[PDB]
Automatic annotation (TrEMBL), chains A, B:
Sequence ranges assigned to domain Pyridine nucleotide-disulphide oxidoreductase dimerisation in this UniProt record: 464-575
Cofactor(s) named in the record: FAD
Organism: Schistosoma mansoni
Record GO biological process: cell redox homeostasis; cellular response to oxidative stress; glutathione metabolic process
Protein name stated in the entry: thioredoxin-disulfide reductase (NADPH)
Gene name tied to this protein: TGR
FAD/NAD(P)-binding domain boundaries: 103-444
EC numbers on record: 1.8.1.9
Amino acid sequence: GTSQWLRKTVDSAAVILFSKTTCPYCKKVKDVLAEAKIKHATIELDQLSNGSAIQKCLASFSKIETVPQMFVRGKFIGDSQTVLKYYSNDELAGIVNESKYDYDLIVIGGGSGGLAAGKEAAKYGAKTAVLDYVEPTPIGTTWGLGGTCVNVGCIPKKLMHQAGLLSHALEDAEHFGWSLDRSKISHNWSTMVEGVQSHIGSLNWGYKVALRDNQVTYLNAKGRLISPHEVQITDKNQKVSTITGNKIILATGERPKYPEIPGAVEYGITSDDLFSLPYFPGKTLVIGASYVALECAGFLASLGGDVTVMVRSILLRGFDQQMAEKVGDYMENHGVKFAKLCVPDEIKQLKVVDTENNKPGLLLVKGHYTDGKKFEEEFETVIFAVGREPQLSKVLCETVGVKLDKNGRVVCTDDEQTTVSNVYAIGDINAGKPQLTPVAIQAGRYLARRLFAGATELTDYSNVATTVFTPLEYGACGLSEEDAIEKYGDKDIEVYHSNFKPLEWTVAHREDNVCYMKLVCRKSDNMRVLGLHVLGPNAGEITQGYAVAIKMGATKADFDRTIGIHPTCSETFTTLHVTKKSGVSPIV
Amino acid sequence: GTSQWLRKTVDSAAVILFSKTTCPYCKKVKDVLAEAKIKHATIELDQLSNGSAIQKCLASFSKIETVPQMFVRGKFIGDSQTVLKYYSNDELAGIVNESKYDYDLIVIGGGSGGLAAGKEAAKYGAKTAVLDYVEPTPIGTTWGLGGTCVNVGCIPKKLMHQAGLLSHALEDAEHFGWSLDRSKISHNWSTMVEGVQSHIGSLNWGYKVALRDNQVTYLNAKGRLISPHEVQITDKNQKVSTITGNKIILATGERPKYPEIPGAVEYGITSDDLFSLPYFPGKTLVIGASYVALECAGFLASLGGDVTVMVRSILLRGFDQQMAEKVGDYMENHGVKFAKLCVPDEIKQLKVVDTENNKPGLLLVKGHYTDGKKFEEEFETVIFAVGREPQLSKVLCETVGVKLDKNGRVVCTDDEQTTVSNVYAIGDINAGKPQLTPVAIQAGRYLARRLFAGATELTDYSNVATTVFTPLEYGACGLSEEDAIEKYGDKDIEVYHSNFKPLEWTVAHREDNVCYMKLVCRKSDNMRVLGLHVLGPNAGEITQGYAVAIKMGATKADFDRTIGIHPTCSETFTTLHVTKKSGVSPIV
Ligand SMILES: Cc1cc2nc3c(=O)[nH]c(=O)nc-3n(C[C@H](O)[C@H](O)[C@H](O)COP(=O)(O)OP(=O)(O)OC[C@H]3O[C@@H](n4cnc5c(N)ncnc54)[C@H](O)[C@@H]3O)c2cc1C
Ligand SMILES: Cc1cc2nc3c(=O)[nH]c(=O)nc-3n(C[C@H](O)[C@H](O)[C@H](O)COP(=O)(O)OP(=O)(O)OC[C@H]3O[C@@H](n4cnc5c(N)ncnc54)[C@H](O)[C@@H]3O)c2cc1C
Ligand SMILES: Oc1ccc(CNCc2cccs2)cc1
């Protein structure tokens, strides 16, 4: 019953006050703790819907059933007079700071989930340490605090995506009446990297400050869990030492893989390097077909580069494959070339990168197709986006006993708990969860509230919406069409779909029938919406609101009875009617 | 119950077949009707939850209980042998064209709702006429088929808005690395208007083609209803004649109002003239405070014009007022001048418009502030945006019986029926309804299904989302905050809000804390979202999807459990936490 909740909370919380709102004796303790700069969690029992039962089990720890009761790391401290006695005797500081370990929580990894978990834990009185270290790339690139998204991920690529998009606005401008001469317009790579890097730098520093003003200790060190409560750390000056913590959170994420071919590590780069590269890549070869590969090929072509993408098999594996093909067809018609069904064999250096003059090198790529024929072409730059992976042998001593799945990711319960009872993992290294930054932040926030504040909310990991930021963006929430058919049978699946054309595209003389959307619906369940898909401008802003409706179990009927906002792209979802089974064309 | 439905359906349907999806006799009649180009509604009894009692109740009209049964305008026509016999003998075409009236449906008004009702009715075999005539403005402006939105509303105004937004792309371009000199670039009004008008012309054409292909009769004539079934039509040649119909749908919309001051009609213009003006307005005074006024002042400013808005009292009366003031503040910080608490007293002409050199005139405007001080200034163009009104005197003879509310709008039941049992009204003139194109369209399609296909679905007019396309856009769904407090009391209303900054605005050096959103919730009803508000870019794309969740009863918890898409603006709705009562700052 309620009893096992209360004991979990009391054993885990660092400082926690069971209080009531209309209690002037409770206010006296809150104010004293606030003046002493003592942060704590608070459980207002008159607001929880079974506070009476809780007030009874409290007596199992404190032998009293009144309010307030203050606890520190599992130990009952006093009622109002006892804490007030400690305070006027100068004994309150040394009691709240009494712990078996150096910290209440050590977070290994200062990325999206790590930093989120750390700040949230500190709010409730947990002495917290956050460790972060950025191991350099093969050519030596390195960056500041924040993790992959901040430094070499979502933030720089979308800013470069946006620089690409601005090229369309210079194309459109004559049709809308602006007199600029588009043919004498060049883009400057290094100017744009400076502005992107400058915003990035403002985020590293913002994070360092945030940690400081939350009383979190930031340690720029490499962590290693040598035992369930012991984390070993290495300085930037090689200096080694050991710190201890009650709870450990692992949040060290992933890094880009390289194919095992001669020349790859020596002569190629990855996305870790692309966002601070000091020279324009030049004629580029992007090898791979994930969203990283397609997004990066996309904005290089838009900034005027000569870009080729080498695809082993298909585009965007695991995504709706009608949509992936539409995405890829847009790119192929708007200046991205593809070497389909082709694979690399080696990279040969012909020219070394010129640091002085700020120029790329020259490379020779040898590959072959699946018919056997040979690929041979020279490129100034070669980017590998062939997947990402964790390296938990650098982080996690095998003797500690954290169970890893077959890819190297951490097996966790639905509350992020590992096979060692005090160790948890969040974000990209949590086996089988969506690898996305908002997921890592919600995971790490919600988990901090459970350990140190007595919350019960779990992170919900299903139907998390995504957006691929290719030249024509692709937004999705829910099942792909092939997955929905394979799960319920083709007779049980109805798909409503339609092309559309942004009103902005009419005067600009753009394509009529490339933008596309569809709803995938289960017949036998009130036409429930299993998955939404849209290819068009601003696809993230379009998709996001519908993720709420879908989390609430939206049906086709719900979409019909809601009225559109006009003129928008997104309103076309409110009047879909052509089914795929009908065979009627979806064009405009 | 069921009995009354079946008799309403049989009485107003034009041609209707009762059928079942398995019956191969019914398939025989469908094929004859198809081959004869006979359009008809079809009800498939085995797909309806009470097809048994319906099939029995059919015998009250036909004296048989079997399927298929074919009816024409209330009269039972036969089973399969009788239909086949009529076809075989050349009698079927005459039977199905038998009517007491010229038309099953006459639509007075060819705009958003009118066109939508007509096309839908035609699909089920209703012989349909739509009338549309555009009374010219005071200076002579006139336009083609489609209504106010297509020709002088949502379509031209968003295109002009979009031209204005393009100016920020060219400001933003230098910071993302593109070379162009923003200073040597200028805008050509007439080039822009040619592109807008070209798209509008292709909409005028598309609609005449759609009516032709649906066998709808289109008469470019002004309609007056003289009796319940008699519509008097007047030619572009002034020829008068009378046509009759079973059902009448009034869908005549509204036109701009003018203040009763000297010189307003002679020398001012309205939005009806703005979108096709052959010269650039020049220095402009917009008189009004509605969305029309603010959206037009907005794009005129972004296109380099010298723009002043003259406001009697407040901005955007009827919208959440905190949101309205953030809208006006933004416009004022970006080049729109405001003359506050001011009203105009007369317009004097200093220059006649120059048709020759294609230039505007010159005008002197006199007015006064609410404290008596005088207003006096020169402008080249004065645009009145002081409301809109219907002119049902020109459509509706007194003696017919159609009740009007005190505004001239038509009083209708929740199924759009007027005080005259066969006359209906949809769109802007339907009293008490949100005056929006998606609304007018949905009402027209749903009503046509009920008249001629046996449908029961009503149009749901509650919580229709909206977007105001000012320089910084404002999307909304549900109640204003002040309305929500007036209705439930302050203690029962919680408001979560935050500022935000688009990632696109970081490198562009745009403002940190100007974009804003809030959720207005009800504490006693599970923290139900009563109103959603967002000021920022793509606010209509942002808001639309959430309208579906609001319709389904979404709470604050529903927003919390959904994960955001990153990086987006709209993802801010998924982690809102600062409340207004807490007094914490909403900046970031
Ligand atoms: C090119 C690219 C684009 C992306 N775009 C998007 C997007 O648009 N939207 C989206 O939602 N997601 C996007 N992602 C994914 C997103 O970046 C990740 O899901 C997210 O960053 C994972 O966060 P995390 O907290 O799990 O780990 P990370 O953010 O990777 O942070 C882990 C941190 O811990 C550090 N660390 C590692 N080992 C140690 C150690 N032993 N000691 C100390 N510190 C250590 C790492 O160096 C790093 O700083 C993108 C990823 C890439 C590569
Ligand atoms: C400047 C402006 C901007 C707008 N922007 C938006 C927007 O962004 N989004 C939105 O949802 N709404 C917008 N609206 C509102 C939208 O235009 C109306 O809600 C919509 O047109 C209502 O459609 P309706 O069918 O009721 O009327 P209308 O579209 O006005 O159609 C009525 C038609 O009937 C004709 N008619 C009138 N009298 C007769 C007669 N006696 N005989 C025959 N024909 C006749 C009229 O000339 C007209 O063609 C805007 C309106 C304006 C003025
Ligand atoms: O809602 C909107 C709809 C279209 C646009 C302009 N289109 C930009 C693009 C051109 C090519 C790919 S994306 C802006 C907002």
